Amino acid sequence: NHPMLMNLLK
Amino acid sequence: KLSEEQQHIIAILLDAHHKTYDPTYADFRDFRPPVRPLSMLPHLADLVSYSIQKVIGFAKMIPGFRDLTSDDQIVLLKSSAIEVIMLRSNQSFTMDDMSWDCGSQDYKYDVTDVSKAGHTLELIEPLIKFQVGLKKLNLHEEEHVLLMAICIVSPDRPGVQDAKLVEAIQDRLSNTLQTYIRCRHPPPGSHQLYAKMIQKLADLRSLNEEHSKQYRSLSFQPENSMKLTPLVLEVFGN
Numbered sequence A: 001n002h003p004m005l006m007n008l009l010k
Numbered sequence B: 001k002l003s004e005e006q007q008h009i010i011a012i013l014l015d016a017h018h019k020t021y022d023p024t025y026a027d028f029r030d031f032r033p034p035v036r037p038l039s040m041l042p043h044l045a046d047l048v049s050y051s052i053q054k055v056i057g058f059a060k061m062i063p064g065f066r067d068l069t070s071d072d073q074i075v076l077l078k079s080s081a082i083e084v085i086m087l088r089s090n091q092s093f094t095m096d097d098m099s100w101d102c103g104s105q106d107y108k109y110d111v112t113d114v115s116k117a118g119h120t121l122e123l124i125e126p127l128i129k130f131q132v133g134l135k136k137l138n139l140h141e142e143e144h145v146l147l148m149a150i151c152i153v154s155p156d157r158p159g160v161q162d163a164k165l166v167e168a169i170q171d172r173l174s175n176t177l178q179t180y181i182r183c184r185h186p187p188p189g190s191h192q193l194y195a196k197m198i199q200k201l202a203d204l205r206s207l208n209e210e211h212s213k214q215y216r217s218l219s220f221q222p223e224n225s226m227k228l229t230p231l232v233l234e235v236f237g238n
């Protein structure tokens, strides 16, 4: 999973 | 000619770049201090980490990128990250001494600094050659932002699912770049400019590949992995 990337994407 | 949409596409990308690239390089002061045994790793790790955040900010503004799924957006960013950082760094690269001038001497980087980050000439040599050839193209800023957006939205990136949709978004960007060159880039600088720009994307694939190899090598050592950041580990690998 990519929590940080995900967070930066939304 | 350049339709309204295409003109809109360029304006959006230009603004997106301006909002993610600080030509004053003021944030470099927040990074762990550069030291000139991998003395530049903490510093460059932070710089790269910072750059990844900026590249993501740019990607989200690429018309159509947000329409993709969460997984495809992630796949595109992890695979293009290092390529866009190399590509966007050309803005600070100088053929005067083949170095990257980011404001002050402390933030002026050269082949030695990159080697002091754990990388070898196998990557650095072609990286400089790339920087040199890209610079020689003297791209309009419009061409520069379009190239970065096209690099990010590439359908052949491994792990991609909706390649069809990814390809449609990229084609819209490609046709925008091609049309822009014809209408706004005067000859002879426009001679095979598109093809030369695409060749740089192929060049980046090779650099990406070599970087990953050396990265896997460097990060395999816990002592080195320890000096990286959480974002770098998540995106480049762990």
Ligand SMILES: [C][C]C([O])([C][C])[C][C][C][C]C1234B567B189B21%10B32%11B543B645B786B917B%1021B3%114C6571[C][C]O[C][C]([O])[C][C][O]
Residues within 6 Å of the ligand: B041, B044, B045, B047, B048, B051, B085, B086, B088, B089, B090, B091, B092, B100, B102, B109, B114, B117, B118, B215, B218, B219, B232
């Ligand atoms: C952390 C992963 C690593 O693998 C160590 C395991 C180190 C990889 C470092 C990659 C790099 B740094 B060096 B090349 B490219 B970046 B930075 B330095 B050189 B190019 B770019 C470079 C020039 C600086 O660009 C300044 C740009 O105006 C801003 C970029 O947004």
